[PDB]
């Protein structure tokens, strides 16, 4: 009941008290915690789709379950499992060629294909009613950072998600700069214009060596030679920073030593240098790409060559779950972008994050293979009819096993009709008649309430989704039919 734009979501509550609402079939199965040794194979199946495609995640399971179900009427007739497995293999090899018949080549310069495909993936999401905003955001988030026409892969880990409570989906952002959750101290600046930004790993505190250090006092004034020297040491560190010409410091969190002493911040606050502190060791990779700064390990190397630029660095005063820092604009921006997610409830925000990633994966597929097919059940009806014609030319047991593979193909247009409120008995029959006549682009139109042209409705799915759905589902079930002996260990 969670297939197609007319499907519904599920709530799952774990034993700790974490309540989630989700549509994505992969996120449902991971939380159900199914125990049966044979059904857990479906969880691994959905995991592979999350890696390989990113949006093939529901149809792969209903196919795999149907292929196994189609084998019951074969096993009950005495057909050896090895006959069924080889027969499904042959059906797969023909099925993939059938799918290519519907393909259309595209180029990454076509803004309409990109917007239409990203929109299609959102129709089944809880944010389907915000597609007029999230769709051009999903495309812009990717097409500006992957250097189109120079590569055949997309690494979506450079698109970061920042989640805040407050506002609604219309308030989401696609800022091209750096968004930090760190705090600023002191708060007497809060905004710097035309900043030079530096990344410092040096600890602005008292000197210390790897060896155990002891200061020995043996006289009256000797204690004052210590206090006056440490004050001068820290000031000298600040003078090296100030003379460089920087405006904003990015301070990496230190564990063994204090990174920012009170005296160091005292001088820095008077010299009008804004300090962002508690930046994690895992954050500097994104900072280095986004802003373009370089870390300095030894303060003596802190010179202009390690400084970047920012047009505006300001603290953003939000009325919701706290506040954030936003650094917008710089010379030679890197191949990064941040998406800021809004919402009234935590349950909506968490689902929005998955929906954003689902849309981002659409282009990732289209870069890998620049070909799409019509959706709406069109390739499933085409497979069912052409595979039937294939089976009519076979003999022996294959003539009964191959048609079983084809029979499973109709589970999707049947389910889509039911979820939309349509009678599947006439809907699926009419679909098979129209495609037999030659209407290869006919399918289920959940907006009109009937069968119409899929392409006119801009419901288009990457070719890779239908190719991978059959490849991964078929290999999985041909393995399941091979494992046939349960042993409980002692």
């Amino acid at each position: 009941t969670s297939l197609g734009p007319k499907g519904m979501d599920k709530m799952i509550q774990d034993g700790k008290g974490d309540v989630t609402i989700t549509n994505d079939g992969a996120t449902i199965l991971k939380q159900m915690q199914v125990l049966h040794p044979a059904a857990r194979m479906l969880v691994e199946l959905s995991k592979a789709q999350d890696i390989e495609a990113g949006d093939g995640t529901t149809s792969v399971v209903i196919i795999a379950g149907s292929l196994l179900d189609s084998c019951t009427k074969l096993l009950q007739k005495g057909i050896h499992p090895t006959i069924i497995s080889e027969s499904f293999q042959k059906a797969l090899e023909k099925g993939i060629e059938i799918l290519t018949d519907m393909s259309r080549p595209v180029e990454l310069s076509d803004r309409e294909t990109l917007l239409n495909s990203a929109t299609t993936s959102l129709n089944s999401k809880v944010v389907s009613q915000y597609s007029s905003l999230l769709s051009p955001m999903s495309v812009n988030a990717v097409m500006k950072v992957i250097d189109p026409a120079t590569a055949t892969s997309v690494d979506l880990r450079d698109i970061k998600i920042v989640k805040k409570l407050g506002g609604t989906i219309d308030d989401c952002e696609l800022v091209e700069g750096l968004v930090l959750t760190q705090k600023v101290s002191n708060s007497g600046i809060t905004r710097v214009e035309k900043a030079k930004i530096g990344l410092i790993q040096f600890c602005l505190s008292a000197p210390k060596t790897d060896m155990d250090n002891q200061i020995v006092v043996s006289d009256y004034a000797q204690m004052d030679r210590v206090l006056r020297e440490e004050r001068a040491y820290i000031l000298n560190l600040v003078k090296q920073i100030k003379k460089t010409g920087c405006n904003v410091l990015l301070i990496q969190k230190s564990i063994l030593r204090d990174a920012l002493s009170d005296l160091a911040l005292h001088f820095l606050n008077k010299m009008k240098i804004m300090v962002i502190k508690d930046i994690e060791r895992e954050d500097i990779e994104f900072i280095c790409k986004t802003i373009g700064t370089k870390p300095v390990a030894h303060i003596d190397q802190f010179t202009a060559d390690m400084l970047g630029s920012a047009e505006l660095a300001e603290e953003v005063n939000l009325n919701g779950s706290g506040k954030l820092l936003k650094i917008t604009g710089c010379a030679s921006p890197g191949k990064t972008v941040t998406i800021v997610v809004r919402g009234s409830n935590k349950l909506v925000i968490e689902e929005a994050e998955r929906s954003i990633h689902d849309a981002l994966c659409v282009i990732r597929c289209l870069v890998k293979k620049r070909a799409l097919i019509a959706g709406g059940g069109a390739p499933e009806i085409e497979l069912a009819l052409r595979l039937t014609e294939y089976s009519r030319t076979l003999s022996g047991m294959e003539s009964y096993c191959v048609r079983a593979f084809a029979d499973a193909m109709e589970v999707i247009p049947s389910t889509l009709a039911e979820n939309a409120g349509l009678n599947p008995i006439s809907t699926v029959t009419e679909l098979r008649n129209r495609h037999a006549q030659g209407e290869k682009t006919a399918g289920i139109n959940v907006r009109k309430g009937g069968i119409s042209n899929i392409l006119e409705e801009l419901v288009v799915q990457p070719l890779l989704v239908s190719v991978s759905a059959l490849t991964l589902a078929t290999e999985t079930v041909r393995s399941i039919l091979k494992i046939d002996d349960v042993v409980n260990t002692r």
């Binding site: 915690q33 125990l35 059904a39 407050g166 409830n345 349950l347």
Partner: protein, 100 residues
């Protein structure tokens, strides 16, 4: 036959009916404290600490809810305090009626 999930699973009209009840059980709390003609509540915890209030925010922050459909209305009240600062009574009453 059945799912091998070790918990408890309810579908269909079971949850569609329960969420209406749980939402009503929250709106029923603040409906009685709307307007100048409303009356105050006294909240007493297990150990004897007594709080007097009539605002939807304090009441729903102090009173524990269990049904996942009731937490939604409690969060709604918390958002109103953050965004506006006041009026935190009609957002629970109106939202519950939209579900009904």
């Amino acid at each position: 036959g059945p799912l091998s999930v070790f918990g408890d699973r309810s579908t269909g009209e079971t949850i569609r009916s329960q969420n209406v009840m749980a939402a009503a059980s929250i709106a029923n709390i603040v409906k009685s404290s709307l307007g100048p003609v409303g009356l105050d509540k006294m909240l007493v915890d297990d150990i004897g600490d007594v709080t007097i209030t009539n605002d939807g925010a304090t009441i729903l922050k102090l009173l524990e809810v269990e049904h996942p459909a009731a937490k939604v209305l409690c969060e709604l009240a918390d958002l109103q305090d953050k965004e506006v600062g006041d009026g935190t009574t009609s957002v629970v009453i109106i939202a519950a009626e939209l579900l009904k």
